[PDB]
């Protein structure tokens, strides 16, 4: 539900809800990245 | 991961796709158990006259055995094939870059001594 994103410039973990302009609350940077999922991906070391 | 059908090329116009992949026990090997990473067909050389491929392979064998980087600058009279061959004969190899290889499937020597050595290949 929270969908916490990371700032491209300040690297801050901040929560943003839908219908919200994409703005970091710590520095106002406009580019955000999603965090790595918690799902379990498996690799054959090959 | 490279596979049958992927296109590879040397720096001499010698392009080609992977026909098949053999495991290390299926590939031909030298007396010291070096198997080729790639095997290319001799028929790609004569019509094309990519002698730079062969000189680069020989220079690369010298470079790897000597611990240096070969100088393949185009117009350099201080580097010719006879010098490279004389250098390679100092590291216990046939001066022309040939080696006795053994058939990986049967282990018998191949009657024709094969030309083998490091060459810079590209994955396209």
């Amino acid at each position: 539900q929270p969908m916490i994103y990371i700032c491209g410039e300040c690297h801050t973990e901040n929560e943003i809800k839908s219908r919200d302009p994409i703005r970091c609350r710590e520095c106002g940077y406009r580019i955000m990245y999603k965090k790595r999922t918690k799902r379990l991906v498996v690799f054959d070391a090959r | 991961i490279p596979q049958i059908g992927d296109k590879f090329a040397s720096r001499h116009g010698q392009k080609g796709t992977c026909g098949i992949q053999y495991r290390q026990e299926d590939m031909p090997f030298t007396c010291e158990g070096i198997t080729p990473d790639i095997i290319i067909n001799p028929h790609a050389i004569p019509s094309r006259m990519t002698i730079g491929h062969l000189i680069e392979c020989l220079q690369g064998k010298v470079s790897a055995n000597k611990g240096e980087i070969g100088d393949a600058t185009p117009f350099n009279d201080a580097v010719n094939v006879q010098k490279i061959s004389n250098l390679l004969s100092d590291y216990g190899y046939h001066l022309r870059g040939n080696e006795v290889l053994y058939n990986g499937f049967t282990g018998r020597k191949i009657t024709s001594q094969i030309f083998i050595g490091p060459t810079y290949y590209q994955r396209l």
């Binding site: - | 991961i1 098949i20 053999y22 299926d26 499937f105 049967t106």
Partner: protein, 115 residues
């Protein structure tokens, strides 16, 4: 996309026989042994051991396709002998040779580590 799993070279598929014997009708006293999930490693030794049998008239093997994972070994023997018997004796002889080689390598290692 089309890469077979690497175990398919070694593992038998369900309902697939390791070895199948088919009578060769062209000449008498000949058989084709289609061995699945083996390669030159066993084919070459079985062929070369069969060539040591004077009652074997033909002994050859082939991997019909490298991308496929079977070998075919053709064995023809003299009329008083059998290709199945020849193949069995070849495997027995290879096993005995490898047992002797293993014991002698153990002895050589013991000598080398000791003195």
């Amino acid at each position: 996309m089309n890469a077979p799993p690497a175990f398919e070279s070694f593992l038998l598929f369900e309902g697939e026989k390791k070895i199948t014997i088919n009578k060769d009708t062209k000449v008498p006293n000949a058989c084709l042994f289609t061995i699945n999930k083996e390669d030159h490693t066993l084919g070459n030794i079985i062929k070369s051991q069969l060539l040591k049998d004077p009652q074997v008239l033909f002994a050859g093997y082939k991997v019909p396709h490298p991308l496929e994972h079977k070998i075919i070994i053709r064995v023809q023997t003299t009329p008083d002998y059998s290709p199945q018997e020849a193949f069995t004796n070849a495997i027995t002889d290879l096993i005995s040779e490898l047992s002797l080689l293993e014991e002698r390598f153990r002895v050589a290692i013991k000598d080398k580590q000791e003195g």
